[PDB]
């Protein structure tokens, strides 16, 4: 079955969830992800400085 209805409704609803994720969800998770990498990088570098 195919009847054209609710096309504009779903189109607008998608942008709302995309911009919400972009502002609220995405930045804090990447910051927390980078901190572990930075802490481990500092730890491995500090171990090399100790030998040096």
């Amino acid at each position: 079955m195919n009847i054209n209805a609710t096309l504009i409704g779903q189109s607008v609803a998608f942008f709302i969830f995309v911009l919400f994720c972009m502002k609220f969800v995405w930045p804090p998770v990447i910051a927390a992800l980078q901190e572990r990498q930075k802490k481990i990088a500092d730890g491995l570098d500090a171990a090399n400085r100790a030998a040096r």
Binding site: A46, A47, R49, A50
Partner: protein, 52 residues
């Protein structure tokens, strides 16, 4: 590990600077002995030339 490395590094450098000063003091004892022996030798040599 970094703190332990700095403690061991600093402690052994104390030993090296203490040992370096001790080496130089023994050289000063030797230096004083060789000029003392020369000053007494010169005293006996001048006595020999005057008797001659």
């Amino acid at each position: 590990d970094l703190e332990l490395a700095h403690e061991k590094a600093g402690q052994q450098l104390r030993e090296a600077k203490a040992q370096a000063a001790e080496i130089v003091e023994q050289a000063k004892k030797r230096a004083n002995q060789i000029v003392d022996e020369a000053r007494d030798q010169a005293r006996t040599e001048g006595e020999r030339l005057k008797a001659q």
